[PDB]
Design a binder for this molecule. Structure first.
Ligand SMILES: *SCCNC(=O)CN(CCN(CCN(CC(=O)O)CC(=O)NCCS*)CC(=O)O)CC(=O)O
Ligand SMILES: [Y+2]
Ligand SMILES: [Zn+2]
Length: 122
């Protein structure tokens, strides 16, 4: 029962500047996640080592409609490349209790990104 989750890349949203909406993405394995450049200047990229072991890395083009197939269970931390240090990230939680979530929380990342991450988790 494969489902698509559409995510918008925005200069401004609910949580402030440079956001993915939603920035928590709840998915099942086999679902898809579509990133939409609603405003110009965004893309989506998996953060090095912040996808589940078994998952494959990716980096979309700026202003590209990009669809990701989330086969492997676990947590994905994605960033917009230019806006990463401004907090432009999304957490994709695939299946229950995503295994590498504590790992991603511990991993090295900008304070401002940590802030947004902990907020979405909470
Ligand atoms: S696109 C990234 C992911 N999937 C995948 O299976 C990638 N493969 C790379 C082959 N490599 C070694 C295979 N391997 C060793 C390992 O990583 O434990 C067996 C396995 O994928 N287990 C999964 C991850 S915790 C090199 C590598 O990327 O590590 C294809 C493959 O033959 O598995
Ligand atoms: Y592998
Ligand atoms: Zn951006």
């Amino acid at each position: 029962a494969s489902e698509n989750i559409e995510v918008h890349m925005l200069n401004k949203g609910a949580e402030g500047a440079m956001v993915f909406e939603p920035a928590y993405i709840k998915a099942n394995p086999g679902d898809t996640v579509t990133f939409i450049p609603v405003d110009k200047g965004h893309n989506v990229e998996s953060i090095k080592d912040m996808i589940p072991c078994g998952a494959c890395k990716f980096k979309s083009k700026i202003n590209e409609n990009y669809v990701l197939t989330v086969t492997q269970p676990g947590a994905y931390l994605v960033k917009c490349t230019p806006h990463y240090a401004m907090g432009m990230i999304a957490l994709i939680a695939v299946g229950d209790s995503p295994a590498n979530l504590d790992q991603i929380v511990s991993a090295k990342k900008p304070k401002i990104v940590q802030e947004r991450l902990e907020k979405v988790i909470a």
